[PDB]
Design a protein around this nucleic acid. Sequence first.
DNA 1: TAAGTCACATGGTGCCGAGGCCGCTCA
DNA 2: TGAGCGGCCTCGGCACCATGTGACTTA
Lengths: 69, 241, 92, 143, 221, 391, 34, 31
Amino acid sequence: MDTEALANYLLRQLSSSQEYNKKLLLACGFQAILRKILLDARTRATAEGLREVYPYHIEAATQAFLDSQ
Amino acid sequence: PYTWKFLGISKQLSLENGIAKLNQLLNLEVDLDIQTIRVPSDPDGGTAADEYIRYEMRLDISNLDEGTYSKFIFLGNSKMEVPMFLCYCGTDNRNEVVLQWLKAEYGVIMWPIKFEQKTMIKLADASIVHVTKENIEQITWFSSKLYFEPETQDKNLRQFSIEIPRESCEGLALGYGNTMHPYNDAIVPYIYNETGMAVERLPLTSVILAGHTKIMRESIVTSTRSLRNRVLAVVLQSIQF
Amino acid sequence: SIKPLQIMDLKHLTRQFLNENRIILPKQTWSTIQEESLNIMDFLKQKIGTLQKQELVDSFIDMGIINNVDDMFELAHELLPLELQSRIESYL
Amino acid sequence: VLLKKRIKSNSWFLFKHTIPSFIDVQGIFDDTNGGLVISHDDAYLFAKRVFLQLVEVQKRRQIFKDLEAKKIIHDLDLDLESSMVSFFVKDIKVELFVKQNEIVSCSILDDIHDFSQNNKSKWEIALLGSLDDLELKLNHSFA
Amino acid sequence: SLILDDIILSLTKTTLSLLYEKSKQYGLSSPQLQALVRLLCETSIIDTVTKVYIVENCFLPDGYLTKELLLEIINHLGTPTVFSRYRIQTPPVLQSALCKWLVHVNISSSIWLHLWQFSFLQKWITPLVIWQATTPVDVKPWKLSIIKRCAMHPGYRDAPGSATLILQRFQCLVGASSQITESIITINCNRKTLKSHRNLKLDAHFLSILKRILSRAHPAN
Amino acid sequence: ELRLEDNYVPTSDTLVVFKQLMKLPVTVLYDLTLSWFAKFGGSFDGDIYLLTETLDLLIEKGVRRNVIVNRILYVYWPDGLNVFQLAEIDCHLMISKPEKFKWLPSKALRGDGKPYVVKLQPAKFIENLQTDLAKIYHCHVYMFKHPSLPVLITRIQLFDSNLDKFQGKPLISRRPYYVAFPLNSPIIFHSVDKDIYARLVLQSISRTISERETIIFKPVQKIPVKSIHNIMTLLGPSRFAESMGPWECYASANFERSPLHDYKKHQGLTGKKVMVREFDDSFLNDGKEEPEIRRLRLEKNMIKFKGSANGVMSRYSSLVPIEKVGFTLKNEINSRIITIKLKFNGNDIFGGLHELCDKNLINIDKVPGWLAGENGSFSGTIMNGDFQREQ
Amino acid sequence: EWKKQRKDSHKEVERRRRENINTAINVLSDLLPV
Amino acid sequence: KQRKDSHKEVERRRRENINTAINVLSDLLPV
DNA sequence: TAAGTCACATGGTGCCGAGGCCGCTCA
DNA sequence: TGAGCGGCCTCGGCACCATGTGACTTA
């Protein structure tokens, strides 16, 4: 499932070429949010020592992220 | 968990000369070690021409895992039809470069080694007899597990194993008597007498010594960092013509 | 339903990122991030409703992700195929 | 039924048997001489005790099959030991739970508008007893 | 035959049918194939379904494929970038079908590897870069780095399994270029997508058509 | 009121039911449609005889089963299938494909310890089970007799409770739990499930069977076996129970006839052809042996592993295929307990061992009883030469 | 290495301890009725 | 925040069960 | 300092339901 | 040519023993 499929998801959520580029940049930003959140989740899991992450880890990470945003 | 792949060598190659060429080719110094072991020290296993030459080539860079610790072990005896075999652990890509250099420098013919059923039984016999610094041999008992994968029609019997605990194995050995090959003389005849299975005829894929090693038909993987002299010797008599 | 994404969509989306950088996700974490994708999309649409040139890069600077347009088409480099990042570079 | 000698006690044990599970041959064998059996007399006693059960099931099935053969009752269903049965006399579904050569339970199921319930209970009480008595009284009440 | 390039110069419905039947009877020469692909790529008045029907039914070589045909094809497999906007974008389905037709039939290895970074081409570039790698000296750590970087890259579909196939071929080929099986471990571990990638279909009807055309072509060649 | 009647409609996915009816043949679909419309009716309008004529036109039109599946899922019952339909289709799938289901046996011990030969009054048993399980969960139970086997198979289905999920008003079903009742046998076969609902169903079944003295189900085996016919051959009330492997000749009685029979055809008069078996160890020492004595040693292996010279009838397939057995042989060699744990795996353990014996890999003169298939599908410890099963 | 040899010796000691535990468990099971 | 029902948490439970069995066995012993 | 006991955290073998593609396969 | 059942088989979740190493104690 490519990034263009996520752009299709976003356009069907909101419903030419320049708006396609805008939505593609939006999909890239969404992937950046997910990657940063998962990186914070691993950082906190390694801080606690657990090999995997858990829902409370990533909930705390995303609350700390949205606190700054 | 260090798997040893075994390859025979058609010629008695001398490694104390020409290894500087390998050092120059690999841009790193290898730690070649020379030993002269005499494996069948028991009187019933032979008393003459027992000396072997053991080379331990080691691509030494760092010591964290087998990615920088792909050892090479060579064994040789000039009084045999086939005079040399090698076995190497690890998974580094430099090992096949070493094998290619060994071929192209010494002109040797190298083939992979496959173990038969009696060869695997003899290897399980060899891998418990441990040599001590006081020059004595100690049989360390391990709870073996003979593991078979028969091929039957309609896949009727895919696999079956025979688990033998440690104290039962030493009880069988003491029941047979003072012997230095417990599996071939006590364990396997007891299995044949009880269950009717001749394990030297059945397709035997691995015998697993719990916590020490588990040898297979094409590879030997050992928890111990090295391979003892008895296993190397039994492999050397295995490939004879 | 129609607006929430599926679990297999998230596997296909971020499976390689959890593989190159070693991440282990149990099923509870997968369901949690499936729930979180909706919140992230709502927050992104609340922050950026309509799309024009300067406001998106200003918001992404405010997002704390980037510092310039160089970071924009370098982050697009690591998240897009070659034709799409070339098209984005022609757009920026 | 095949009995093998125990290696350490010199007594027979229930090795293999070809008798179905509604006859507790292991319980009968353990009941014979209080567990262990040695002499051939105890083995013959266990054999007779289980052969009586075989006679019971065969005789019960024979009586019910003869009831079917004489056309006194309509189509019936037999289980494996012929204990839980059901049959029609004219159209009344009479189902019986019968123990060894003696009916211990009865149930008249089919209801006719002319048919009552106190006469039904009286018939159910009267139908109890032996199997030959059941055949005789059922042929008596059929006429 | 001369009918084929006569129809080609005429194109510079009836002509399409004549070209189809003369390809099914004779097959085009390498300059004829060059002219045909040059006419097909540059213009866009021809329908795309007819374009893929041509590249799957009309391109039938007779002898050796010359290097100039490959160089002309490579010129058409590019994409418009910030340094080249005058040339029009070749349709991606046409590029994929042309690469599939290439599957049907040291510099060039890097040429095909740098074209492997295209997402839509990955389903047919991989047999070409497998078949190009015939010697242990061909592989290099920069090739491995590019393959791993594009494999673990998101936004792709065929990259994990196909690039795992490429790395498996490289591991089976060189036995050097220090160990890359853990790189295979980092890429997908499903044994299903590359299982479907490791067996590929070449439209055996077209294979039989080319077989009969080539049997009609040169003796002892 | 918490018991579930035979007219409630649950929320079932239409695609799962669509692919579920694909496996059934056309004639059972025909019989099911007429039975369903005779009992419950449907959204389709017409007489029962008119619908019979319509299905008749369908079956001499030779139409595929896909069209009639779409009909019965889209016009006959478009709102949803009733619980009786959902149980009866799955029971018909069980009848059509018995090899896709695994069963676990459990003896019905009672009181002192003597097994209880369970006998069922089916309608009263279903009513009592539904009233007992209605106190805990939303239960629907359906019971039928096998067309071939003498069993009574029940099907217990349990229903549970129920970003903004909009509205469904559902009753989500779980996987059904099957408990098979043979006619007269203490052994009870039930489906393979170890969650709390399976324990609840077995507990309620034990409480509702008894009604006179408390009954507990003790599991006699932990390794599931497929194909309900095979588990009736093994654990059911048949002659083949407790006579397996080399002793299937006694369970089939092919070697002796009645004492009222011809005494010219007796076994002792006509005799049987055998070979001298060498008690000296000569198997390990040893090509193109005589084809008559080769047939005799093949017959010897066949007799040892299947009980009969010709077998119970490729040819290695036993009466019941066994998937997993594990034997723990223990001996006493000079006051030392010596244990050997043999574990097996495959589609047919003793057929594969028979094939290995035919290939001269296992000595047929030294293969013990428990290895030969005696007390089959039972895994246990062999102490003092006596096999006691595990628990 | 020195520390690697120490780790191997401690590994062997722990393996011997685990084998002794398993042997004692097997002996206790041999004395068991069932 | 105790949603951990995986490894390092179920092996700990099994080890604690084995330890409690060993403890009650030693409690039944005179010494 | 060599050896031992300990819980601990990760490695690993076996198992199975779900589901997918394959592998002919037959009309 | 086209739908179609069955062995394969791998995903992965679970279950259990197996295992190597640091912390700590003993001599």
